[PDB]
Design a protein around this ligand. Structure first.
Ligand SMILES: COc1ccc(S(=O)(=O)N(CC(N)=O)c2ccc(N(CC(N)=O)S(=O)(=O)c3ccc(N)cc3)c3ccccc23)cc1
Length: 280
């Protein structure tokens, strides 16, 4: 069946774990290690293939690597134009967008697009704001970049990229400042879960309604967490790991929108933060 993959991460040191969770029966699979251990990367899926993008070996990474579930093997891909630690990614029409992130002290506002069929990256219009630790979501064939840190200020702003027009517009700001939050899309809304507001790791969660242009708080998580992994599986949000301000979590919580409830449904084989997560 479809699995929740978690790639890389950090606990005491950069990790190369690739593990996958089966919500059906609660089991965990151990898969082929990443070639280079990394945290602060992003994960995504195009055409049934899993991609690990950017991050840092703790050296910032411009790397893109593709994992094939059917062969259990990692294959290097064309690198990005620049290293991107604390990157966000989204997928539109089988193309991977690499958003923001950092190279040393350089906070990127640039964005580039990867085409698997041709193993090529191309720059598109840059964001209106530099964003590292940015959350990314794809909705109605638009790309949203949410929160982050612009090099001096932590951000509650969000903005939206129009692929056909190749341009960005700011949207309504979130209620809370969030860097390192989990951003995903569930039933036509953008969810921003956790992250760091400049003082604390957060357990609060807000969702954006694109038509009313409003961010509304929903039920908070049980654990405060920043740099959590996030994905959507069968109509539910799953968050994985993260840093709560003291410990590297192994908690995996699951949000059910029908009940507006969070519940802890499993734990990773070891606590970690800064993972890349995707489902296939
Ligand atoms: C003061 O405590 C904090 C305050 C704010 C944040 S943050 O979440 O907001 N943030 C910075 C930002 N501007 O977004 C981030 C920091 C570090 C990362 N990692 C390493 C990396 N690749 O850089 S890590 O996950 O592996 C890791 C986390 C915590 C510890 N202790 C060690 C390692 C992040 C990875 C992804 C997204 C955001 C990351 C975090 C801790």
């Amino acid at each position: 069946g479809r699995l929740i993959y978690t790639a890389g991460g950090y606990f005491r040191q950069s990790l190369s774990y690739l593990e996958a969770y089966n919500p059906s029966d609660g089991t965990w699979l151990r898969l082929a290690d990443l070639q280079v251990p990394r945290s602060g990367l992003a994960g995504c899926v195009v055409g049934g293939l899993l991609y690990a993008v950017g991050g840092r070996n703790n050296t910032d990474s411009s790397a893109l690597d593709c994992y094939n579930p059917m062969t259990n093997q990692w294959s290097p891909c064309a690198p990005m134009s620049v290293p991107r630690n604390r990157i966000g990614v989204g997928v539109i029409d089988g193309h991977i967008y690499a958003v923001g992130g950092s190279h040393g002290c350089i906070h990127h506002n640039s964005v580039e697009r990867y085409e698997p069929e041709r193993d090529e990256w191309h720059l598109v219009a840059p964001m209106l704001t530099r964003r590292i630790g940015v959350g990314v979501a794809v909705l109605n064939r638009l790309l949203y970049a949410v929160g982050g840190f612009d090099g001096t200020n932590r951000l509650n702003s969000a903005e939206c990229y129009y692929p056909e027009r190749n341009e960005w517009r700011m949207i309504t700001a979130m209620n809370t400042i969030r860097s390192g939050a989990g951003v995903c899309v569930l039933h036509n809304c953008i969810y921003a879960a956790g992250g760091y507001d400049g003082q604390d790791q957060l357990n609060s969660v807000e969702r954006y309604d694109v038509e009313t242009e409003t961010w509304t708080f929903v039920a908070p998580m049980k654990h405060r967490r920043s740099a959590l992994g996030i994905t959507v599986h069968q109509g539910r949000i799953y968050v994985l790991g993260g840093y709560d301000g003291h410990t590297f979590l192994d908690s995996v919580e699951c949000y059910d929108p029908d009940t507006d409830t969070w519940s802890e449904v499993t734990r990773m084989t070891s606590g970690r933060s800064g993972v890349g997560v995707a489902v296939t």
